[PDB]
Structures are given as structure tokens and as C-alpha cells.
Design an enzyme around this catalytic site. Structure first.
Site, PDB file in Angstrom:
ATOM      1  N   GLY A   4      13.389   4.047  -0.260  1.00 43.05           N
ATOM      2  CA  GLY A   4      12.093   4.171  -0.986  1.00 43.05           C
ATOM      3  C   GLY A   4      12.207   4.092  -2.507  1.00 43.05           C
ATOM      4  CD  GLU A   5      10.687   2.892  -7.581  1.00 39.25           C
ATOM      5  OE1 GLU A   5       9.733   3.515  -8.095  1.00 39.25           O
ATOM      6  OE2 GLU A   5      11.864   3.004  -7.971  1.00 39.25           O
ATOM      7  N   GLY A   6       9.496   5.254  -5.826  1.00 37.47           N
ATOM      8  CA  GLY A   6       8.243   5.952  -6.144  1.00 37.47           C
ATOM      9  C   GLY A   6       7.610   5.441  -7.427  1.00 37.47           C
ATOM     10  CB  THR A  34      15.428   5.627  -6.650  1.00 33.66           C
ATOM     11  OG1 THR A  34      14.621   5.002  -7.648  1.00 33.66           O
ATOM     12  CG2 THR A  34      16.292   4.606  -5.940  1.00 33.66           C
ATOM     13  CB  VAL A  35      14.722   8.042  -1.239  1.00 37.11           C
ATOM     14  CG1 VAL A  35      15.348   8.992  -0.224  1.00 37.11           C
ATOM     15  CG2 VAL A  35      13.567   8.715  -1.974  1.00 37.11           C
ATOM     16  CE  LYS A  71      12.020  12.943  -5.184  1.00 37.43           C
ATOM     17  NZ  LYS A  71      10.937  13.830  -4.686  1.00 37.43           N
ATOM     18  CG  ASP A  93       1.554  14.704  -3.478  1.00 39.70           C
ATOM     19  OD1 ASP A  93       0.401  14.171  -3.402  1.00 39.70           O
ATOM     20  OD2 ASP A  93       2.639  14.037  -3.658  1.00 39.70           O
TER      21      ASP A  93
HETATM   22  C1  LIG Z   1      14.269  12.634   0.494  1.00 37.77           C
HETATM   23  C2  LIG Z   1      14.127  13.324   1.848  1.00 37.77           C
HETATM   24  C3  LIG Z   1      12.896  14.222   1.856  1.00 37.77           C
HETATM   25  C4  LIG Z   1      14.119  12.328   2.983  1.00 37.77           C
HETATM   26  C5  LIG Z   1      14.753  12.514   4.200  1.00 37.77           C
HETATM   27  N1  LIG Z   1      14.607  11.502   5.038  1.00 37.77           N
HETATM   28  N2  LIG Z   1      13.843  10.607   4.344  1.00 37.77           N
HETATM   29  C6  LIG Z   1      13.420   9.388   4.795  1.00 37.77           C
HETATM   30  N3  LIG Z   1      13.812   9.035   6.092  1.00 37.77           N
HETATM   31  C7  LIG Z   1      13.413   7.826   6.784  1.00 37.77           C
HETATM   32  C8  LIG Z   1      11.925   7.744   7.007  1.00 37.77           C
HETATM   33  C9  LIG Z   1      11.346   6.568   7.445  1.00 37.77           C
HETATM   34  C10 LIG Z   1       9.990   6.490   7.649  1.00 37.77           C
HETATM   35  C11 LIG Z   1       9.194   7.590   7.416  1.00 37.77           C
HETATM   36  C12 LIG Z   1       9.757   8.765   6.980  1.00 37.77           C
HETATM   37  C13 LIG Z   1      11.109   8.841   6.777  1.00 37.77           C
HETATM   38  C14 LIG Z   1      12.650   8.639   3.919  1.00 37.77           C
HETATM   39  C15 LIG Z   1      12.338   9.133   2.645  1.00 37.77           C
HETATM   40  N4  LIG Z   1      11.582   8.396   1.787  1.00 37.77           N
HETATM   41  C16 LIG Z   1      11.184   8.825   0.459  1.00 37.77           C
HETATM   42  C17 LIG Z   1       9.823   9.524   0.441  1.00 37.77           C
HETATM   43  C18 LIG Z   1       8.679   8.572   0.780  1.00 37.77           C
HETATM   44  C19 LIG Z   1       7.332   9.266   0.644  1.00 37.77           C
HETATM   45  N5  LIG Z   1       7.276  10.464   1.523  1.00 37.77           N
HETATM   46  C20 LIG Z   1       8.377  11.420   1.221  1.00 37.77           C
HETATM   47  C21 LIG Z   1       9.740  10.746   1.363  1.00 37.77           C
HETATM   48  O1  LIG Z   1      10.778  11.676   1.065  1.00 37.77           O
HETATM   49  N6  LIG Z   1      12.768  10.342   2.220  1.00 37.77           N
HETATM   50  C22 LIG Z   1      13.519  11.071   3.079  1.00 37.77           C
END
Ligand SMILES: CC(C)c1cnn2c(NCc3ccccc3)cc(NC[C@H]3CCNC[C@@H]3O)nc12
Length: 285
Positions: free
Chosen positions: A10-12, A14-15, A30, A111
Site C-alpha cells: 500500500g501507499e497512503g 508506505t506498507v 509501515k 478514522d
Molecule cells: C500495517 C498493518 C496494519 C497491516 C497488516 N496487514 N496489512 C495488510 N495486509 C494485506 C491486506 C490485503 C487486503 C486488505 C487488507 C489487508 C495490508 C495493509 N495495508 C495498508 C493499509 C491500507 C488501508 N487500511 C489499513 C492498512 O493497514 N496493512 C496491513
């Protein structure tokens, strides 16, 4: 240097996905003043339904949490899945147990929306992205003010309230519950003015009885009178116990609005059908 970078996520910010070299475990990495506020609030907390900050390091900063497989938005948007009343009861139960904890520690999420409720492969739901969370007492500036995306945003915030509380999170949980029931966004405003339009024409423009202070809000402005729509009309599948939880979450007076704890004591949660075992909750491919 300690975590094996794997796949972009992801990019807001950056993950990234990563494999910890010590335990071999899978995590998500993150990568400012509020960046420390975030670590502050999170290194503190421990609750099964709140994402667990495992580690950090500086030099932009990097927060390490457990990997999560999906999120409510993905589930909600996945036509292959049919959400049962038990499924919905489970998601809500976990959501509200996490939010009750946060609120008992005088923290607002600010949020709450379906993509910020993450699920691990065992069906444990967790609140995430505390980039807007603040301690109850901290003041809100006028031009630095951070506010949820408009569809989940509570009326008091749309009327420019700077003093607010748990009702801001509880409204967002109401909009999430509606989204689980309808499988579309409940209140899809195309502007902040249109967000209020939609709120009032769905729920009714508030009386002074329903919302005493409304007129003294900073950005209060006069909308047309709408009768609103009965919730059993909107949510035609929902039993009476659920209808009362929903109505509770969407009370216009932010002080009458149901708290996480009040929500959790509602018959809804003690009635059949029970909440799905996490291992039985619907999973996307
Ligand atoms: C940073 C932490 C909270 C984290 C743990 N797993 N994970 C996944 N996992 C894969 C995924 C795919 C599709 C939907 C949800 C998660 C995706 C992800 N994306 C970054 C943001 C995107 C917006 N929502 C919150 C997320 O943390 N952040 C995270």
C-alpha cells in the site's frame, strides 16, 4: 536489517510485507510529531482486537505489526460471500470490544471505516491505522483538524464541532454496520454539504428535542425538513434487537448516542443466533 522485505502492500505512508529473521514470522512494516503520537498510543496498548505494534525504528520511521490477510471492505465487496446474521454479529462484537477498550483508555480512533478493520487468517478482527487517534483531552486545531472520510463522518463533525467524544467513533460503527447489512455504503455523500443532506433525508432532519445544541454548532446551517425513512424499511432483513442497536448508534445527540459498552450490553449480542466462530467466518480468495 532485521526483517526480510517481501511484497508491497500500500501507499497512503508506505506498507510492506516482511519476514522477521529471528522468529521467521510474517509481519507488515509501515514506513513526524503525529508519527510519535501514533507509536505512543500503540506501544501502550494490548487487546486482541487492536493491531499489535511489535517493534519500531527510525531516517523515516518504520512500524512493525502482525500481518493481516484482509479487511471488511474486501469482504463487503466480495459478491462470492453472503454475510449471515451470525457473521455480522461476530464482526460487530469484535469491533465493539476493541472500541470499548480504546474508549476505556480515553482514546478516540477518529478514522473508523471498513478498510481499517483488518482480519487475520483465523478471523480475528483488529482496529488499525491509528494515524488520527488522539487522547480524549487533546485539543483540535482549526486548520490542522483531521476528520474521517465523509461517508462515516458524524453530523457534529460535519457541522464543524471542535469539541467531541466517543459518539464520533460510534457513528462510524453505525455506518459500518449499515454497510455490512446493505453491502454498499450507507450514506455516500458527494460533498460535505451533501453528506448532511443524505443523513437528514435518510434519518430525518433533527428536532430541537432530538438535538438540543445543534443550532449553536460553529458551521450550523439550515437544511430543509426531511421526514426520514423507518429503519425496518431500510434494513428489511434485520430483527428488532438489531434495529434498536442501529437506532442507538445513529442518535443525533452525540451525548444520547450509544457507547461501545452500552452497545455491547444490548439484547442483540445475547440473542440467537450466536456470533460465528472466527475460524468459520467467510474468507475471500
Ligand atoms: C500495517 C498493518 C496494519 C497491516 C497488516 N496487514 N496489512 C495488510 N495486509 C494485506 C491486506 C490485503 C487486503 C486488505 C487488507 C489487508 C495490508 C495493509 N495495508 C495498508 C493499509 C491500507 C488501508 N487500511 C489499513 C492498512 O493497514 N496493512 C496491513
Amino acid at each position: 536489517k532485521r526483517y526480510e522485505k517481501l511484497d508491497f502492500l500500500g501507499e497512503g505512508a508506505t506498507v510492506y510485507k516482511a519476514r522477521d529473521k529471528n522468529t521467521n514470522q510474517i509481519v507488515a512494516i509501515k514506513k513526524n510529531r503525529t508519527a510519535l503520537r501514533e507509536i505512543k498510543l500503540l506501544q501502550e496498548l494490548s487487546h486482541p482486537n487492536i493491531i499489535g505494534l511489535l517493534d519500531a525504528f527510525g531516517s523515516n520511521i518504520s512500524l512493525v505489526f502482525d500481518f493481516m490477510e484482509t479487511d471488511l471492505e474486501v469482504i463487503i465487496k466480495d459478491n462470492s460471500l453472503v454475510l449471515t446474521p451470525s457473521h455480522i454479529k461476530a464482526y460487530m462484537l469484535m469491533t465493539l470490544q476493541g472500541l470499548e477498550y480504546l474508549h476505556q483508555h480515553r482514546i478516540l480512533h477518529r478514522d473508523l471505516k471498513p478498510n481499517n478493520l483488518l482480519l487475520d487468517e483465523n478471523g480475528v478482527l483488529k482496529l488499525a491505522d491509528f494515524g488520527l487517534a488522539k487522547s480524549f483531552g487533546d485539543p483540535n486545531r482549526a486548520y490542522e483538524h483531521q476528520v474521517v472520510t465523509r461517508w462515516y463522518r458524524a453530523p457534529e463533525l460535519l457541522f464543524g464541532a471542535r469539541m467531541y467524544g466517543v459518539g464520533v467513533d460510534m457513528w462510524a460503527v453505525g455506518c459500518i454496520l449499515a454497510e455490512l447489512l446493505l453491502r454498499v455504503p450507507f450514506l455516500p455523500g458527494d460533498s460535505d454539504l451533501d453528506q448532511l443532506t443524505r443523513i437528514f433525508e435518510t434519518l430525518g432532519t433533527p428536532t430541537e428535542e432530538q438535538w438540543p445544541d445543534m443550532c449553536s454548532l460553529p458551521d450550523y446551517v439550515t437544511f430543509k425538513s426531511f421526514p426520514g425513512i423507518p429503519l425496518h424499511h431500510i434494513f428489511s432483513a434485520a430483527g428488532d434487537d438489531l434495529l434498536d442497536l442501529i437506532q442507538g448508534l445513529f442518535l443525533f445527540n452525540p451525548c444520547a448516542r450509544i457507547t461501545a459498552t452500552q452497545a455491547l450490553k444490548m439484547k442483540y449480542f445475547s440473542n440467537r443466533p450466536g456470533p460465528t466462530p472466527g475460524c468459520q467466518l467467510p474468507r475471500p480468495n
